[PDB]
Design a protein around this ligand. Structure first.
Ligand SMILES: C/C=C(C)/C=C/C=C(\C)c1cc(O)cc(=O)o1
Length: 127
């Protein structure tokens, strides 16, 4: 029914100040400077990317809509690209981890208070 795949530790660079959006939300751009993915289902080095969450208040409560784009190489050398939008993660990689493309991958990300490190635990749902 559900299988643990990997965790990720993501190093975040200097974020840009919030961008005011029409309607009252804000977009916060957080460059990714590196990080590591480790687990039974995926092992890789994060080389770059960005998070671009949107913060929007609806009915008095701020919801954060995550958007994340990251890339690197897997432990076998294969380039990968991950897009995040619980949240769904779409993993595009060939080589030994290629079967991740066939999986419905969900992630639970958290960011430390100072917003220098994001961590996420990811698992596949056998729908
Ligand atoms: C393989 C999964 C990865 C690399 C996830 C990265 C998530 C980040 C950097 C993050 C930042 C943020 O402000 C909100 C959020 O949801 O996630």
């Amino acid at each position: 029914h559900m299988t643990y795949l990997f965790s990720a530790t993501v190093n975040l660079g200097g974020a840009l100040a919030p961008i005011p959006l029409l309607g009252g939300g804000t977009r916060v751009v957080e460059p990714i400077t590196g990080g590591t993915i480790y687990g039974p289902g995926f092992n890789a080095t994060i080389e770059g990317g960005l998070a671009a969450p949107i913060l929007i208040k609806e009915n008095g409560t701020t919801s954060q809509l995550p958007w994340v784009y990251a890339y690197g190489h897997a432990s076998d050398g294969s380039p990968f690209y991950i897009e995040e939008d619980n949240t769904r993660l779409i993993i595009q990689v060939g080589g030994k981890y290629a079967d991740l493309q066939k999986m419905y991958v969900l992630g639970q990300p958290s960011v430390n208070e100072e917003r220098t490190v994001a961590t996420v635990e990811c698992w596949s749902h056998h729908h």
